[PDB]
């Protein structure tokens, strides 16, 4: 898995590869790793598929209840719910989650909840087995307040590298753009990203 969320000028973008493996067999080559927990709050999952799905479902349930009663939840609130589940169940969970969201007061925000259940607010985040190979690349090319077009390019290049070096990553690059304008789903095929 290679997953990332990047904040930019108008919001935030989530990207991921589409490969799921058991050992060296590719169980699914077109997985959707980008998961909606609310209209404009999404997460990328890594670790145990079972764990992360079950967690994602519970958060989605909590935030639907939240909306019924209290209105629109902040991205921080979403991250808090994820943390709670991951922390309190750290013994039986192998889950690493990146939470990304758009919100009118707060613009684009990114939180990462790595394996211990800790929370970290960041301008951008990378995770999954494929991420190790792009720490240098990402640290070098990321700037704050990038345009949409620039941001789409940064994720595309980053994940093509991660895909190139990690056998656990591959397939297509999916992205979700989160802005005041709405929700935009992107996809990029190998023949585009391999030749960068």
């Amino acid at each position: 898995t290679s997953i990332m969320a990047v904040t930019f000028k108008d919001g935030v973008i989530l990207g991921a590869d589409s490969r799921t493996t058991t050992g060296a067999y590719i169980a699914n080559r077109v997985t959707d790793k980008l998961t909606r927990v609310h209209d404009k709050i999404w997460c990328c999952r890594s670790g145990s598929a079972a764990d992360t799905q079950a967690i994602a479902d519970i958060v989605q349930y909590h935030l639907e209840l939240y909306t019924s009663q209290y209105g629109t939840p902040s991205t921080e609130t979403a991250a808090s719910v994820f943390k709670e589940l991951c922390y309190e169940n750290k013994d039986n969970l192998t889950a690493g989650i990146i939470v990304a969201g758009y919100d009118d007061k707060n613009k684009g925000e990114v939180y990462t909840i790595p394996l211990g259940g800790s929370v970290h607010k960041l301008p951008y985040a990378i995770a999954g087995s494929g991420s190790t190979f792009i720490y240098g690349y990402c640290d070098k090319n990321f700037r704050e307040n990038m345009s949409k077009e620039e941001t789409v390019d940064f994720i595309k290049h980053s994940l093509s590298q991660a895909i190139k070096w990690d056998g656990s990553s591959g397939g297509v690059i999916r992205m979700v753009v989160l802005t005041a304008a709405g929700v935009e789903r992107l996809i990029f095929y190998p023949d585009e990203y391999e030749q960068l």
């Binding site: 799921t20 067999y25 169980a27 699914n28 077109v30 997985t31 959707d32 145990s48 598929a49 079972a50 799905q53 079950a54 039986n92």
Partner: protein, 222 residues
């Protein structure tokens, strides 16, 4: 075991081989691995046999009750959600691996479920020890917009790959076709390419061959 699911233009088909094994021994040469969750939602299982049948009957039973309670046809997403939540609760201990397919008022659906409670969606899937042989056929011949006929052929062919090349699969092909307009059609022993040849000899014994010590009538009645 080889099980496949293949989506087509107006529905979804599932197929399976018919071999049951206790280690290297073939126990049943023709069991049915295609099970009904509801009339238009079927599934095939691989892994612990008792588990897949049980998790199928439990959830089938709850789905009936849900349908009666809500006055609506069962949805495949409900079969999925229930199965995945149940399997998850047991942390892998219920060794059920399932391809679940069906038609409901929202359209047609194909899913895979793994024993720890994770799910996948797709247009074509396979599970079982015959998994890779069948997937090799699927990856070769699947296209978007298959007709009913093409999809049956494709799925049938994928099960054959498993039958011929996987020691874990054999005997016959069962198919079930779930088209959006219609009733679901279960096609038991749709293909039978593994007929036992006539034996060279007959082993029926001359009567009296067995030595008997003691004999008596058994009372059944009361």
């Amino acid at each position: 075991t080889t099980i496949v699911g293949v989506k087509f233009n107006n529905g979804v088909v599932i197929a399976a081989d018919t071999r049951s094994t206790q280690g290297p021994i073939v126990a049943d040469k023709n069991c049915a691995k295609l099970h009904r969750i509801s009339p238009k939602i079927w599934c095939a299982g691989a892994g612990t046999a008792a588990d897949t049948e049980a998790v199928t009957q439990l959830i089938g039973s709850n789905i009936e009750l849900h349908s009666l309670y809500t006055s609506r046809e069962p949805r495949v997403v409900s079969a999925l959600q229930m199965l995945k939540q149940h399997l998850f609760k047991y942390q892998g201990h219920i060794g059920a691996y399932l391809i679940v397919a069906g038609v409901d008022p929202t359209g047609s659906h194909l899913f895979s479920i793994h024993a720890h409670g994770s799910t996948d969606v797709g247009y074509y899937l396979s599970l079982g020890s015959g998994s890779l042989a069948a997937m090799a056929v699927l990856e070769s011949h699947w296209k978007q917009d298959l007709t009913k006929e093409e999809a049956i052929k494709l799925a049938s062919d994928a099960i054959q790959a498993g039958i011929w090349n996987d020691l874990g699969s054999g005997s016959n092909v069962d198919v079930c076709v779930m088209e959006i307009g219609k009733d679901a059609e279960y096609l038991r022993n749709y293909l039978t390419p593994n007929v036992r040849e006539e034996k060279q000899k007959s082993y029926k014994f001359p009567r009296g061959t067995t030595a008997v010590l003691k004999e008596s009538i058994v009372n059944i009645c009361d």
